[PDB]
Amino acid sequence: RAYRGGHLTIRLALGGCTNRPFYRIVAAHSKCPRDGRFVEQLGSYDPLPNSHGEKLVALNFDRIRHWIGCGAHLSKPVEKLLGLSGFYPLHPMMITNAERLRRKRAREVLLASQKTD
C-alpha cells in the first residue's frame, strides 16, 4: 500500500512449516510485512542441513548487485550470508563471535582441567 517512507531493503522472508524454517531472500519495502509484498525475489536460503550435510543458499548476484547499486539496505543475516560467499567482505560481527567463542572454549578447557584435577 502507500506508505509514509522507508527504504528498499533486502532481507529474509520466512516461509516455513514450523520447526522446519526456510527463507526467501527478498527485495522489499521496509514498511511492508515480513511475508507480504515485495519488489522482486532474489534468492532463497535453507537453514536446515540436508541429506548431504549442507545448508543451501541461492542468490542472484547480478540482481542483488543491481539493487544495491540502486541503494537497497541489507539486513544483518543477509550480510552474514553475503559475507560467507565472498561476494562481500566477511562481516565484523562474525569475527567477533569467532573471538568470543574461541575465548569461551579456552576458558572451558581450563574449567575442564581444573575440575579433572
Binding site: 534468492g43 548431504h52 543451501l56 560467499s85 569467532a98
Partner: protein, 292 residues
Amino acid sequence: RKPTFMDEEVQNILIKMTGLDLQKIFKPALQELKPPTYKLMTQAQLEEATKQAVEAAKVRLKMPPVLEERAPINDVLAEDKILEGTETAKYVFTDISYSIPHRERFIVVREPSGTLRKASWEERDRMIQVYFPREGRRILTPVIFKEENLQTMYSQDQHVDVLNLCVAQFEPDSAEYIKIHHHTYEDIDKCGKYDLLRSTRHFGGMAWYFVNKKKIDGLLIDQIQRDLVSDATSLVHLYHILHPXXXXXXXXXXXXXXXXXXXXXXXXXXXXXXXXXXXXXXXXXXXXXXXX
C-alpha cells in the same frame, strides 16, 4: 591427425550406418492417448507427408554428444581460519542468474574448515538441478544404476531405455555417463544384440566405443548376416579413419579396396575372430550367386 565424433566424415558415415526405420523411430508411447486425427490425401500429399516424416525423424535421431571425461576441479578461493571454529555444517552458495550457461555458473562452498572452496562436479550439477529443475533428473542419484538393476534391465532387452536414462540424468562429460554407456555397450557386444540400437540415435555411440575398443566383431558379423554390405564397408572405412597408420589400414588401403577386397582384407587383418568374418563373408557371398 584429428578424428572426432563431430567430423563430417564420421557423422555422415554414422548416419548412414544407423538407418531410418520409421516404425522404430516413431513407435507407440505410454503417454495418455488422444483420439487419432484423419485426413484424405493424394498420392502426392502422402509422398510429401512421408518426406515430412523422414525430415522430422532425423531430428529425433540426432546423436547424443560423446565427449571425453572431465577432471576433478579442486581450487580454493580463500582461507580464514578464524571462521573454522564456528563448527557449522557445510554452506553451499549457488548463483542463479537466467542469462548464464550452466558451465559458466558460479558454485561455491564454505566448509567447517573455514575455507572457500569451489563446488565439485557432481555437487555442482545437483545444485543446478535444485534451482534449475530439469525433467527426468533426480537430484539424488536413482537406484537403478546399481549392477543388479542394470542386469535386470538388460535381461528385459531394454537397453535403449538405460541409454536414454543416462542422457537425461547425468552429464555427457561425467564419470557415470561414461561408465554406464560403455558398460552397456559391453553387454550388447557379449549378447550380440547390436541390432537393438540400430534405428536408435544411440548407434553413434555403438560405433565409436567399439572402433576405439578395436572390437568390430559382432557388428561386422551381424551386418553381413543382416545382408548389409555397405554398412560393413563404411565401418571398415571408419576403422581406417580412426586408425590411419597400422599394417591393416595402410596396406589393405593402398594395395586396393572395395566391398570384397577391403572387407575381406580387414577380415584377415582384424584377428579377434577372423574365422567368424571369413565364415559369414563367405555365406553372404554365396547367397548372392543363388539370388542373381
